[PDB]
Design a protein around this ligand. Structure first.
Ligand SMILES: *[C@@H]1O[C@H](CO)[C@@H](O[C@@H]2O[C@H](CO)[C@@H](O[C@@H]3O[C@H](CO[C@H]4O[C@H](CO)[C@@H](O)[C@H](O)[C@@H]4O)[C@@H](O)[C@H](O[C@H]4O[C@H](CO)[C@@H](O)[C@H](O)[C@@H]4O)[C@@H]3O)[C@H](O)[C@H]2NC(C)=O)[C@H](O)[C@H]1NC(C)=O
Ligand SMILES: *[C@@H]1O[C@H](CO)[C@@H](O[C@@H]2O[C@H](CO)[C@@H](O[C@@H]3O[C@H](CO[C@H]4O[C@H](CO)[C@@H](O)[C@H](O)[C@@H]4O)[C@@H](O)[C@H](O[C@H]4O[C@H](CO)[C@@H](O)[C@H](O)[C@@H]4O)[C@@H]3O)[C@H](O)[C@H]2NC(C)=O)[C@H](O)[C@H]1NC(C)=O
Ligand SMILES: *[C@@H]1O[C@H](CO)[C@@H](O[C@@H]2O[C@H](CO)[C@@H](O[C@@H]3O[C@H](CO[C@H]4O[C@H](CO)[C@@H](O)[C@H](O)[C@@H]4O)[C@@H](O)[C@H](O[C@H]4O[C@H](CO)[C@@H](O)[C@H](O)[C@@H]4O)[C@@H]3O)[C@H](O)[C@H]2NC(C)=O)[C@H](O)[C@H]1NC(C)=O
Ligand SMILES: C[C@]12C[C@@H]3C[C@](C(=O)N[C@H]4CC[C@H](N)CC4)(C1)C[C@@](c1ccccc1)(C3)C2
Ligand SMILES: C[C@]12C[C@@H]3C[C@](C(=O)N[C@H]4CC[C@H](N)CC4)(C1)C[C@@](c1ccccc1)(C3)C2
Ligand SMILES: C[C@]12C[C@@H]3C[C@](C(=O)N[C@H]4CC[C@H](N)CC4)(C1)C[C@@](c1ccccc1)(C3)C2
Ligand SMILES: *[C@@H]1O[C@H](CO)[C@@H](O)[C@H](O)[C@H]1NC(C)=O
Ligand SMILES: *[C@@H]1O[C@H](CO)[C@@H](O)[C@H](O)[C@H]1NC(C)=O
Ligand SMILES: *[C@@H]1O[C@H](CO)[C@@H](O)[C@H](O)[C@H]1NC(C)=O
Ligand SMILES: *[C@@H]1O[C@H](CO)[C@@H](O)[C@H](O)[C@H]1NC(C)=O
Ligand SMILES: *[C@@H]1O[C@H](CO)[C@@H](O)[C@H](O)[C@H]1NC(C)=O
Ligand SMILES: *[C@@H]1O[C@H](CO)[C@@H](O)[C@H](O)[C@H]1NC(C)=O
Ligand SMILES: *[C@@H]1O[C@H](CO)[C@@H](O)[C@H](O)[C@H]1NC(C)=O
Ligand SMILES: *[C@@H]1O[C@H](CO)[C@@H](O)[C@H](O)[C@H]1NC(C)=O
Ligand SMILES: *[C@@H]1O[C@H](CO)[C@@H](O)[C@H](O)[C@H]1NC(C)=O
Ligand SMILES: *[C@@H]1O[C@H](CO)[C@@H](O)[C@H](O)[C@H]1NC(C)=O
Ligand SMILES: *[C@@H]1O[C@H](CO)[C@@H](O)[C@H](O)[C@H]1NC(C)=O
Ligand SMILES: *[C@@H]1O[C@H](CO)[C@@H](O)[C@H](O)[C@H]1NC(C)=O
Lengths: 117, 238, 117, 238, 117, 238
């Protein structure tokens, strides 16, 4: 569907925290004994509302909640870390879960430059 | 399926399932991100009396935890130490590995008592209590959290935190009383209207006007009347 | 292989319990605070022995046990939730884990309507 | 590989690995299901004396847990509270998140004593103890379970539960004595032949025939002699 | 890259322990009640330095440590069992995560025997 | 990305990411293996005094655990029971499911005291403490481990273990004293130079030369001076 922000307000700016993707530490900062404590493993960034992504993000997390809660009700796992890996697997199964009929609408093989041959 | 966000035509949108889009590319698991947004950013009331009314106790529902990889700096967080009148703890200790929310400008630490008619405290609107990269459906004792919700999507000044302490009776009820604490013997009757900055300013004037209790009993002040954040002796003060 | 039910008896009917797949809750039943307790998250169904699936199912779970137990012996995970995701990954690796030689027997690309071109 | 069931030619069968079947379609992880079936459905003896003989204590083998998504309504479940003669617990408390099996017509709650010569109780035939969507290789204290096994495959009246209580001495041995309990002072010597419905009927007649102990000591009845389910004073009763 | 063993020494022989892949147990050794204890579930093997694999293995585990530690710092999972499954998913996403342009360099479809047709 | 090893041109190498190799085949998850190698095999000093100096206490860093599927028979393992001078434990108990390293020729069990200025003990060089198919960043109390590192890659005489016991004061410091224990009252001053086999030989001669303490106090021997493994009464002994 489309996402229509239906919230009373929207903070259009997004001051965010997260963790870095690898990144060679300056010397021995990767060793846990020498590295930062739990409080200092975060980076920060600021993202504005170009293309309205911030306000759409807030509406998307709001609308995700019902499905997420129903998923958490049905699982017996105390802590779920596998949603994104399972979405990656679903991505591959949607495209490659059966035989790929070329020129078909559910097969992502393009022999365009194989057609000019 | 749990919704998954994707950027089509310079606009975010939920990917329709039964429609396959071969032009969308997922090159690695790194392109998938889980993300937590604060109810703050949607304009909810963040003052302690309004915020606590969104939480409630319930039994029979086992707690559930889901992780998220990135979060948002919060203006308001909360930290609860609630006991029953007989002194038994109302909230469970934080499970191993669950730390407080990592970025809070104001931590509202509420201590006090309530009936706590339920094994766990849930969010009445179904939101999540956001901890350090872990989102829980329940509240843990003495652990700082922001109210929030989680999103999943496919990619294509320092940190200052100050604690504001409160006292509560009848927590989790229709008749809850709150007191802002300026020291262990001097309190101010709390109103929804009081912002975090107003509480810090009022605290300093009480300290600089010598209006603290210079006895051994509790001194309680009331105060006269006197847009979102990003845009036994009683008395009076006017 | 084939599954031959070699059990002393077989209950040919299957009264089953499980959890629902999403499903819009009536109003606020998705909120954990308002939703059902642990005892009332289940649906029920009844399935009879059409195509002999029930009696084959009982034999299949019986014959699965040896491999499952040997898998549980070799893992250090106290609780295993990843068998089905790993079978999905194995499904994709069997077909797409190497180069796909068209018209070959281990490549599931059919250019049938690409051949009529 | 752990077997995986698939429906070929209107018949279930284990998918051969080294043979690739391009006609088989797996469109999403939703098509994969884990499933638990009760030993009940294979015709095993379900009476307490026969069932308990299939379980035994053993040390050196760490317990293991695997989840399953769907299960079968059970006629018979079991719930054990076994101690050593010195009063120490024989079975571990249920780990967090493991609840009783969700659908049981009869829960056979057995309390009593045995030597318990082992750190955990396993299934001697290698089956699983089925809990609420979690299958364990061991028995947890005071937690209701059905005996069962798990299957994995690719897809292409209310609930009434009554508890039957027992007393056991020499649990987990060749010379185990069992007593059906009608109240805290009135018991019936248990035989393998007694079905659940027979136990409930005998209990009611004892209550309606006034045959309960009207003293302060334990009254033990023996009884005269008097197909699967889906198809110190002693005395006598005939 | 290439792996250059830069360690002070290298044990060129590798006496290893691991667990077996299924393997029909002699009778009832698969039942946990009858099977071996935790101390006796291991097999053993010995592998020498043919092709220099042993000394390269020691250097590879040494050089893996920095990335592994940085990954463990960023995760909130107390015990991580998902690195290999996630690498399998990444393997499939690298090749099949988008449309497969035949004869292209990032598409592993070979119509060689489909070209002789 | 975490490096992944692959065999190209009869040589192991780290697979470059941005270069796709269609000739590489991954037929199942079974082809992927996680693997643990001992620091032993790289030539590090394995004697207790040298090994312990590579470990240190630190707070604020939550412990982390990762599994590995295959390991290497170790010549030297270690097992620590360290308390503060006031008798409080320095190391945490092993979490459920973490057992000792499965193959050790010599387990160096060190008991004693140190300041332990930190919540957990980490490896100062960033290596892992290898347990039974689980690698941890920290040391667990009374649990046998080898020092090691983990690798990930794509595939294309009995067991005798003897315990060597030690006593330590000032553990985890620059001025640590160690004593090899031959019985509860007879000790030998420990030097880095002493190999495991030398300790076992010296222990036997002390037993066969009657040089054990035949009093009720502790007897401490010093000894005169007298390549990798795979290739209060004091006194003296020369
Ligand atoms: C995703 O985003 C949406 C939109 O922002 C959120 O929607 C909110 O949903 C909650 C409930 O889930 C709503 O809360 C309810 O508000 C009702 C009306 O609010 C006021 O307005 C009327 C005037 O029209 C007044 O008469 C009324 O008194 C309120 O002052 C209330 O009627 C509801 O009452 C319930 O709670 C009270 C207090 O606990 C009880 O006494 C009642 O018995 C009853 O149980 C309730 O408070 C909220 O208004 C919605 N917001 C908006 C903007 O529509 C979603 O919650 C959000 N999802 C997540 C997961 O964050
Ligand atoms: C999958 O499905 C199959 C088939 O349904 C199940 O097979 C059962 O396997 C168990 C063992 O794993 C069998 O139990 C054994 O039965 C033997 C014979 O049973 C009786 O029949 C003979 C007459 O031929 C009598 O002489 C005998 O005394 C029995 O009355 C016993 O000899 C075995 O004895 C063992 O246990 C006893 C009691 O504990 C000990 O004293 C012995 O020393 C010995 O250890 C044992 O009891 C069972 O019979 C099999 N059933 C069938 C129908 O063949 C699988 O178990 C099942 N898998 C799972 C995981 O559920
Ligand atoms: C992967 O493999 C590599 C190579 O084998 C390993 O590299 C080792 O890294 C550690 C640190 O991470 C090194 O340890 C350091 O050694 C320095 C020099 O060692 C001696 O040599 C000089 C002479 O050149 C002497 O002057 C010196 O005194 C040493 O005797 C030391 O200077 C370092 O000192 C640090 O520790 C001491 C004691 O704790 C402190 O007092 C200091 O303040 C300082 O903090 C340090 O000891 C080691 O030498 C490297 N080995 C090699 C062969 O180069 C990686 O560790 C390995 N990775 C993993 C995860 O196993
Ligand atoms: C779509 C996102 C844009 C931005 C970076 C995001 C991200 O994780 N980017 C990675 C790559 C770029 C950079 N190096 C950081 C790490 C991806 C996280 C975001 C977010 C974070 C927190 C709350 C809500 C949203 C903010 C959403
Ligand atoms: C093959 C199965 C048929 C039937 C529904 C099963 C199932 O999970 N079906 C889903 C889709 C249809 C419906 N909406 C329910 C949910 C799939 C579960 C089954 C089962 C459950 C319990 C024990 C043994 C077997 C019963 C096996
Ligand atoms: C590349 C490997 C070669 C050898 C067998 C390895 C393996 O796991 N082989 C399986 C298939 C063959 C056999 N049946 C055993 C099981 C794969 C594990 C190895 C290893 C183990 C321990 C430490 C370091 C390295 C040793 C690395
Ligand atoms: C809650 O309090 C309000 C006013 O304080 C009152 O009107 C209402 O009756 C109370 N609710 C209950 C259940 O007593
Ligand atoms: C205030 O009270 C708390 C708890 O009662 C105590 O820990 C703290 O030390 C007190 N502070 C002062 C200044 O008395
Ligand atoms: C209130 O003011 C005093 C005066 O400096 C200060 O020490 C104290 O920290 C203030 N309280 C809060 C909650 O900031
Ligand atoms: C003592 O208390 C009074 C009122 O509580 C206040 O006005 C005064 O400033 C305090 N300090 C003094 C009198 O030094
Ligand atoms: C178990 O009991 C039976 C009869 O009650 C007896 O024959 C057998 O010897 C006993 N087993 C042992 C090990 O004593
Ligand atoms: C029976 O005994 C149990 C435990 O001894 C006790 O909890 C229960 O209340 C008793 N019931 C009656 C009716 O005495
Ligand atoms: C036995 O009969 C009495 C009489 O009504 C009843 O209350 C009791 O629950 C019965 N026992 C069981 C186990 O059903
Ligand atoms: C008392 O007990 C006897 C036997 O135990 C029984 O027959 C009788 O019905 C009971 N009740 C009475 C006598 O009221
Ligand atoms: C550690 O001990 C050495 C010698 O034993 C000494 O030179 C050094 O100063 C000590 N370190 C500290 C921090 O005191
Ligand atoms: C040696 O001491 C330990 C602990 O102090 C004790 O457990 C052990 O029995 C003792 N052994 C002898 C032979 O005294
Ligand atoms: C030391 O020698 C005695 C003599 O046999 C032996 O019993 C003891 O186990 C030895 N100590 C060690 C650590 O091997
Ligand atoms: C007694 O101790 C001395 C020295 O400690 C030793 O030489 C002697 O062999 C021991 N045994 C005796 C005297 O029987």
């Amino acid at each position: 569907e489309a996402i229509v922000n239906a919230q009373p307000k929207c903070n259009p700016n997004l001051h965010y925290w997260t963790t870095q993707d690898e990144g060679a530490a300056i010397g021995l900062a990767w060793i846990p004994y020498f590295g930062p404590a739990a409080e200092g493993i975060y980076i920060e960034g600021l993202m504005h509302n170009q293309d309205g992504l911030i306000c759409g993000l807030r509406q998307l997390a709001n609308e995700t909640t019902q499905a997420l809660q129903l998923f958490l009700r049905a699982t017996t796992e105390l802590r779920t870390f596998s949603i994104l890996n399972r979405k990656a697997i679903d991505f591959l199964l949607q495209r490659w879960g059966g035989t790929c009929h070329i020129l078909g609408p559910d097969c992502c093989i393009e022999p365009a430059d194989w057609t000019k041959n | 399926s749990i919704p998954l966000g994707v950027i089509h035509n310079s606009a975010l949108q939920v990917s329709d399932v039964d429609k396959l889009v071969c032009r969308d590319k997922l090159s690695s698991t790194n392109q998938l991100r889980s993300v937590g947004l604060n109810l703050e950013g949607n304009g909810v009331a963040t003052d302690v009396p309004s915020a606590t009314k969104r939480w409630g106790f319930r039994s029979g529902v086992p707690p559930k935890v889901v992780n998220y990889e990135a979060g948002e700096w919060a203006e308001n967080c909360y930290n609860l130490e609630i006991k029953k009148p007989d002194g038994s703890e109302c909230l469970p200790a934080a499970p191993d590995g669950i730390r407080g929310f990592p970025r809070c400008r104001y931590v509202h630490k509420v201590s006090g008592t309530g009936p706590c008619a339920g094994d766990f405290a849930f969010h009445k609107e179904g939101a999540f209590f956001l901890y350090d990269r872990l989102a829980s459906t329940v509240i843990y004792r003495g652990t700082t959290f922001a109210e929030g919700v989680v999103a999943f999507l496919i990619l294509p000044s320092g940190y200052y935190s100050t604690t504001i302490r409160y006292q509560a009776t009848g927590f989790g009820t229709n008749e809850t009383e709150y007191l802002f604490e300026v020291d262990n013997l001097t309190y101010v009757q709390l109103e929804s209207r009081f912002t975090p900055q107003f509480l810090l300013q009022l605290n300093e004037t009480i300290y600089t006007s010598g209006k603290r209790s210079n006895t051994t009993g509790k001194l309680i002040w009331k105060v006269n009347p006197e847009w979102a954040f990003w845009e036994x002796x009683x008395x009076x003060x006017x």
